[PDB]
RNA sequence: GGCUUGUAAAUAUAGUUUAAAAACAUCAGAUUGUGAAUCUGACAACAGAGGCUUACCCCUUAUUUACCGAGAAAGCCAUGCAUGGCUUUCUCA
């Protein structure tokens, strides 16, 4: 009964692989091979993509161990599902937006603004230009604040991307600012991995962002007395933001913890540096006191604002610290007994 | 979890999905039951029948899961004919196998006779993954099996050249297997064997020992005697009383640790970042400047301890202590800890300055590389005080070989403060003087082989010992 | 002061007419809301006291005007100000090429109809309406004061039927001004840049923030208050005649 | 040069705009006389050549605007300039208070249709017209000229009307500009000064005397050859664009 | 409301500038009289009362400058205002060649020096004091306010250094307001007309009478209180920026 | 046509004035490129050919002038035309709150000497040898042409002195023009945009990118050659006099 | 003013929060008729590297919190009068 039934549905299953391989058949190149490999961790369940790129199985093939490939399979079938989800909510949004439309329709009521608009409904063309002009301003008379792109050796692809996209967050934050930075792309290579990165995301704007790009270093643009290099390893805490000096922020996304590279670059530059004054003002509780690009930026536009620490700081992960310090005014209490001490 | 041992007869299985399917999560049956299986081994001859009607549902195909974990129930329950039956469906069925899938399939084709198919299997998943430690271990176990020592040892250099570290069990089935026939080419592999796992520090379980005592009684060329023995103290052995290893190390070794932090701290680039090059050569000339040194003693190590207790007065009563030994010291000083302090009494500085030479060194320098240094470039009669695991400096060594003497040089050459009042008095921790590693001397051999029951934690060892005399 | 000072403003209903209603009566001046029928003037008119009076007109047509300048003279005896707000404002762009899409001949027609045409209905109407004040010291017999716009000088796109009428008014400030000096009539004109009316306060949250950044400084949209204290100052100056004032906070409007 | 070009002058049978179409002419330019069927338009046609086409429309009425395009590109198959020439002068104070006197609203109203609206139709017709053009190397599809006055800056006593009219050209000049940038069409404006046209040749010869004496130089009346010539120059410049151009003789219209 | 304020007037010792002091410290601010040491202001700053003070100073020299801004800081504290009222006028032709006379450039560059070149000084260094005060309610740390002329518009026959003075404060009025415009100071020039002050007493008394009479209205010269009147309403009002205001009476003038 | 005109250029050397030079005597007329010693004017007389030449000269100084006058009246004997496009540029803030810079007023004293004195010197030191020529059939004797900004009415931040001399140089336009008009020469001024010469070297590139891109159209940087047909247009008629051309291509500088 | 080792334990969301996948966000192109409140694209990695199979462990780095001073007494235990270890008390810095 049930022995017969398996062993003929098998050879039924051996005859649809011969009648499958009758077709022609081409050489092809190993990763070809690997997607069959794929295919079959799909058929288990494992978190592997449903379709892949040949870039992408080259990519997995130059991972080393099989905990990366691991990791690199469950990083695309994230991104894959994310994107399927995405797709079928902005569906799902799509057709409620028509029956929505139509219900409109049905009204017909009309009178609408009395007709009576004083603009054109253009105003992201005109938040994009005027963004531009501020730039351009800037450009001449902005205060420079230079991301050094010397750190593509301690990176790797994954930390390259997410640099790159700090950056893109980073100058958008500037550029919709009331007082924009002059933000100089420093030690930024020509055909090194950031840039090419970042043309790849840019796309045609890259020559039409009001920053300046250069492969000079930072020293060899500005006076080495009036450069500050901001890292977290530094003996010297930032106590207020000076309008006459260079703020050097380190494009490094350090995912693995490579504590003192900055540092060290500053020290072999000979430059000053200064770190946030976190613990001062804040409970850090558990965290990573190195800050995001983005992070870094806006504090930094807040400070220039003439915005206060605490304001300034609100930028820092919540999740990070419990809180600000309760009022620091027992500090300024300490201060001023010493200062009666002295007198 | 009504689950019986007959045929599914056809109708049964309706009745098995309703009000079943919201019982189990993960859609239960098909998923489920397969796992439920595999107890008393009865559950193989029904499984078939649960397969035959998923089939029957089907348009005459099986899910390569189901498959997968038929695969991996038969052969837990070794039934070779179906191994042989289900190697044929992977061969109709799909180009590839699946990782794992291999794996059962290996399990399962180890008792038959085609071995070499495994060997195929074992290489057409190295071309696209690197295979795992359980495929080794089930590859290496079916070819002895077969009688195929050559390949067997090939695919064991084959392991150590993908550096993974090999499974006991793996090496327990090879002197099993070994213990039928004897050969002097298989003796020197059991010697290398033996002289790996010395490197490796590992210790063996008791079937091993008991693999360890058969095989090398029943060597013929020359007689055995082999016993279990007690540690005593340290003392020799105690049965047959031979020297018990050591927590020093010999001459030879201890010069070769000095070449290799030499070759070391030339060309080291965490190294110059954690410690200047400059620095470490300052240190290198004021090092050969001033003469050998007896002892090292450490950083603020000795200073923090005991918070209450001044860090100044600590370290004059500690140095001054040391001094009424008349031996030559050394001590490792701090920039930071020039600069004058609460902590730090300029007088007591000084005093100790002039007692004994000094060397300073910034934050971001590491002491243990300087301490390494200068006991190795001491010799093998100095001592070092710490308290410090080194587990920073251990990481990141070229070979395991090279750590392994690390860690007993950190052992040895150790005066461990263990005074649990320093006011009180000065005291200084003794020294085992032995380890737990195999010794393997000449004309006999003693391994740390621990017993199976205790669940040895990290930091402990092996109680018992066996031996082997004559 | 302008303590006794009848003003006649049109579109005083709303906007920077309402607000220069509320300053003059405030001060102890009289006002006439000039308005459409159906605007909610007589609320307005009605909240701003017994010195305060509504009449609804059209500017567009003579017939209306008269009947509002006769009213408000019946009511306070004579007129000594007149502030032109009244006003519509139509953005649409000359042509889309990629629509395929012209300007409506029938919108610009309306729009120079409200703006312009009302404007110079209203100041002719009036000022004939002051001829017959007798002069004081100074021989002034009366002031009119329009509402222009920064479009007449920069008018941006879809701007085309707003930036004429306003430019008209502009262009016929002087020549009134001269027309009116024999008898003794102050005429001026104001151009608001963007001003916190009901003709921008109902644009988006995001768009109000995004022009209050555009104004260079202050860096808000223009209070009417701000108008009102204009024209009251223009007002008092016996000095300033046949020009126009951009109170617009140093904006220039973007393309 | 202008060799080859189509042009759509508006009341090219008169004054300046005949001047531009002589020019343009005899240049080798093709133009299209837009005016009055009563304006003797034909025999000017007529004499210019057969380059030259009468079209009988008012400026004022749609369709008779869109037949006379529709008129030209038959003739000859696109249109590359628009020269809005057409308009009407009136002389009327704002209010004579000695002959108890009003300005009358059908004169504003008339002016501002002929001289604002009109021009304004045409515009946006001949925008329509040329966006099928295609775009040259500098990406110009066509040009608009407009003519405006002196009286838009520096107006005269019982100018009001004009000056309205031509202070709005003057103020759509810059929006339109920057709403036809996309499709590429250039917009500009002529101020002209005092010319010797039958609008001011019909004068007695005591006022065009003294009107020549008051020219600071040259000492007389503006010859349409001259605005022929300017109106050429800003056609063949690539670059003059949403800009008031006052060919006047440097003479400030007292007042 | 203008109490509290505290001013520096340049030139304030005389005409426009004396009458602006006089009509604010009439109000509780206080003025500095920035004016050179021979003017004889410290008569008028003794006249005004404790409430102002007189600083001798030299508008063209930095130090002089410095020194008067210091001054007006250690006696009151604060520089709420600036009215640059200093300058001078020449009357000279470019050419005369009947005469074979040739315009000095030493005339010339003294004019620009001390119109324009010292009204800039006075807006730099002012900038720096008026940068110090604490934003007050809406972000204004400061208003400046310069004295144009209508000759930056239509300038008559032997102007041209004064007109370049008075045009080259036009053109940078608008630059200054965008610089200062984070900072929170106001930028604005008025361009008085015919005002009745001693400027005027050079020219010959028939001819000063002629140009009162061509005056549209006031049929008269400007009264100094009238242009005070126009600098406190610019000051009150908080959204005039960079703007110029005609205070005229509608006159163009002639040739 | 300009055939057998003589040009006096200043700057002619790079720019503008090269562009106009190449122009005219490509035209057949003279060209006289007044230009300091080191501009290297030497190598572009050089290569214009026999009817240009090169007068060493610095616009500031009276001497200089009058010597590159003589020696051009020594090779031609008659000065028809003078072309002031002779400049520098300055970006720098007026104040700086945030990094307490303040404008030099050195910078501004040289861009007005350069600029605006010297430009006045030219015409004043010019206008003595077109006297000397016989009035034309027209009864003109030559032409001046000065070179202005947009900036003069439109200056964006960091742009006071400069703005400053184009505005005075606008301010004098007209009242030069009423000085020379009895001795028939005619003053025009050309306020060109944004044009890819030298000037704008001083600019980022991504700076200069965004600007040309926001022109109306064309959205490039003017070409200097366009400049040129434009001075020549001036040149040619008869009737412009007195007026600032606007050659900008429609755009309009924001803060 | 008291700021520097080490041992132990607990955690680590690279734009931010919440849960154990969502919202607000980010960059590029859309001259948008006023819901552009949108359309087409880009990036979506729960500290870092090793394994374990189906859900867990080894190691590294970082953050935070504890850990250490001594005298004796009281209740005892083990080793050769001394040493080691736990619980409460006050004492000295
Ligand atoms: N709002 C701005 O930012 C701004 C800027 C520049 C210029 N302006 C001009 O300022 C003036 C003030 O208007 P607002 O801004 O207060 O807008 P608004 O709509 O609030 O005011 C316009 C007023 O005119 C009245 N009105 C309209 N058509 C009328 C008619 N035919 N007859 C009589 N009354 C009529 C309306 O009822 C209303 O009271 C308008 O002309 C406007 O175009 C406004
Ligand atoms: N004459 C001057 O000195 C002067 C000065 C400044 C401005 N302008 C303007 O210059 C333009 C030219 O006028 P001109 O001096 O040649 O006088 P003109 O009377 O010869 O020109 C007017 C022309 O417009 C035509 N026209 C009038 N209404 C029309 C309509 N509805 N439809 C079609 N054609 C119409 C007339 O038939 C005539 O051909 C006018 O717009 C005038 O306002 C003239
Ligand atoms: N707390 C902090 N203080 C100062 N700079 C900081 C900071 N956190 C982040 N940054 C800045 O943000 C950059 C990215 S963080 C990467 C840190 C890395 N360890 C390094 O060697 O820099 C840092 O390079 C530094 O420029
Ligand atoms: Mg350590
Ligand atoms: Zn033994």
């Not at chain 1, 490999?37 to 991972?63: N, Y």
């Not at chain 1, 693995?256 to 540096?273: E, F, I, V, Y």
């Not at chain 1, 870094?296 to 919540?318: H, S």
């Not at chain 3, 003709?199 to 923030?209: A, D």
């Amino acid at each position: 009964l049930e022995l017969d039934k398996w062993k003929t549905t098998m050879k039924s299953s051996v005859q649809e692989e011969c009648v499958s391989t009758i077709s022609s058949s081409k050489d092809e190149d190993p990763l070809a091979a690997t997607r069959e490999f794929i295919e079959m961790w799909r058929l288990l369940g494992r978190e592997v993509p449903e379709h892949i790129t040949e870039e992408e199985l080259k990519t997995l093939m130059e991972c080393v161990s099989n905990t990366a490939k691991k990791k690199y399979l469950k990083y695309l079938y994230t991104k894959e599902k994310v994107k399927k989800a995405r797709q079928i909510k902005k569906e799902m949004k799509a057709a409620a937006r028509e029956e929505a439309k139509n219900i409109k329709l049905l009204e017909t009521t009309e009178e609408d603004k009395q007709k009576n608009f004083l603009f054109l409904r253009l105003w992201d063309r005109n938040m994009d230009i005027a963004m531009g002009w501020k730039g351009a301003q800037a450009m001449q008379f902005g205060q420079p604040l230079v991301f050094d792109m010397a750190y593509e050796n301690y990176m790797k692809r994954k930390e390259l991307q997410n640099t790159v996209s700090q950056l893109l967050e980073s100058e958008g934050w500037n550029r919709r600012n009331v007082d924009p930075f002059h933000i100089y792309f420093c030690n930024l290579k020509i055909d090194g991995a950031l840039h090419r990165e970042l043309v790849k995301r840019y796309q045609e704007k890259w020559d039409k962002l009001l920053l300046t790009s250069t492969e000079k270093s930072h020293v060899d643009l500005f006076p080495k007395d009036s450069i500050i290099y901001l890292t977290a390893d530094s003996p010297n805490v930032m106590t207020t933001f000076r309008h006459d000096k260079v703020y050097v922020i380190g494009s490094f996304v350090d995912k693995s913890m490579q504590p003192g590279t900055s540092l060290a670059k500053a020290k072999r530059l000979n430059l000053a540096t200064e770190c946030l004054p976190l613990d001062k003002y804040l409970q850090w509780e558990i965290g990573n006191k190195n800050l995001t690009l983005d992070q870094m930026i806006r504090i930094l536009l807040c400070l220039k604002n003439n915005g206060n620490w605490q304001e300034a700081l609100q930028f820092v992960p919540k999740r990070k610290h419990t809180g600000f310090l309760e009022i620091s005014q027992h500090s300024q209490e300490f201060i001023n007994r010493l200062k009666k001490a002295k007198t | 979890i009504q689950l019986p041992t007959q045929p599914l007869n056809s109708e049964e299985w309706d009745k098995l999905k309703e009000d079943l399917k919201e019982n189990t999560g993960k859609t239960s049956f098909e998923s489920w039951i397969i796992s439920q299986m595999a107890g008393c081994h009865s559950s193989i001859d029904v499984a078939k029948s649960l397969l035959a009607w998923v089939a029957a549902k089907n348009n005459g195909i099986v899910s390569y899961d189901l498959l997968v974990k038929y695969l991996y129930l038969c052969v837990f329950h070794m039934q070779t004919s179906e191994v042989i039956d289900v190697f044929e469906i992977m061969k109709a069925r799909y180009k590839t196998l699946e990782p794992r899938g291999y794996s059962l399939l290996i399990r399962g084709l180890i008792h038959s006779d085609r071995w070499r198919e495994a060997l195929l299997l074992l290489e057409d998943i190295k071309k696209v993954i690197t295979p795992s430690k359980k495929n080794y271990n089930d590859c290496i176990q079916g070819a002895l099996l077969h009688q195929d020592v050559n390949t067997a040892w090939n695919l064991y250099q084959e392991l150590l050249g993908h550096d993974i570290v090999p499974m006991l069990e793996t090496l327990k089935a090879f002197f099993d297997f070994g213990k039928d026939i004897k050969d002097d080419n298989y003796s020197n592999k059991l010697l290398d064997i033996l002289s790996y796992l010395r490197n490796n520090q590992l210790y063996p379980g008791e079937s091993f020992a008991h693999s360890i005592k058969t095989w090398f009684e029943s060597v013929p060329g020359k007689q055995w005697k082999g016993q279990f023995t007690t540690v005593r103290k340290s003392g020799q052995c105690s049965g047959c009383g031979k020297t018990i290893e050591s927590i020093q190390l010999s001459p030879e070794e201890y010069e070769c640790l000095k070449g290799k932090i030499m070759r070391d701290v030339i060309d080291g680039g965490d190294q110059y970042r954690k410690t200047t090059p400059q620095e470490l050569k300052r240190f290198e000339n004021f090092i050969k400047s001033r003469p050998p040194f007896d002892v090292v003693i450490d950083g603020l190590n000795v200073a923090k301890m005991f918070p209450k207790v001044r860090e100044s007065q600590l370290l004059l009563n500690v140095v001054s202590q040391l001094a009424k030994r008349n031996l030559r010291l050394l001590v490792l000083g701090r920039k930071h800890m020039l600069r004058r302090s609460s902590q730090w009494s300029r007088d007591e500085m000084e005093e100790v300055q002039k007692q004994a030479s000094c060397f300073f060194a910034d934050d971001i320098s590491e002491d243990a590389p300087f301490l390494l240094y200068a006991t190795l470039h001491s010799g093998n009669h100095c001592r070092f005080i710490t308290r410090d695991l080194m587990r920073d400096h251990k990481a990141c060594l070229p070979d395991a070989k090279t750590q392994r003497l690390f860690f007993k040089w950190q052992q040895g050459h150790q005066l461990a403060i263990v005074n649990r009042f320093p006011g009180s008095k000065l005291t200084f921790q003794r020294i085992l003087s032995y380890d737990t590693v195999v010794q393997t001397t000449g004309d006999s051999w003693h391994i740390p082989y621990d017993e199976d029951l205790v669940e040895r934690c990290s930091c402990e060892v092996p109680t018992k010992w066996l031996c082997l005399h004559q | 002061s302008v303590k006794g000072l009848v003003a006649v403003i049109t579109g005083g209903a709303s906007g920077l007419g309402l607000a220069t209603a509320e300053r003059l009566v405030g001060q102890g001046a009289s006002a006439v809301l000039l308005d459409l029928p159906n605007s909610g003037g007589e609320a307005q008119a009605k909240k701003l006291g017994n010195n305060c009076v509504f009449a609804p007109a059209d500017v567009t047509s003579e017939k209306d005007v008269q009947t509002a300048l006769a009213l408000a003279k019946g009511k306070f005896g004579r007129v000594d100000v007149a502030v032109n707000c009244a006003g519509i404002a139509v953005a649409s762009k000359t042509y889309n090429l990629k629509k395929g899409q012209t300007h409506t001949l029938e919108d610009f027609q309306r729009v120079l109809d409200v703006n312009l045409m009302g404007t110079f209905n209203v100041i002719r109407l009036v000022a004939g309406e002051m001829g017959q004040n007798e002069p004081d010291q100074g021989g002034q017999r009366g002031v009119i004061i329009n509402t222009a716009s920064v479009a007449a000088f920069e008018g941006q796109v879809g701007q085309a039927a707003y930036s004429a009428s306003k430019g008209g008014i502009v262009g016929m400030t002087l020549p009134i001004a001269r027309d009116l000096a024999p008898i003794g009539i102050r005429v001026m004109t104001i151009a608001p840049g963007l001003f916190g009316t009901p003709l921008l306060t109902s644009l988006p949250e995001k768009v109000c923030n995004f022009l209050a950044s555009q104004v260079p400084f202050p860096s808000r949209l223009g209070d009417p208050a701000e108008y009102a204290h204009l024209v009251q100052a223009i007002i008092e100056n016996p000095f300033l005649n046949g020009e126009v004032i951009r109170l617009d906070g140093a904006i220039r409007m973007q393309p």
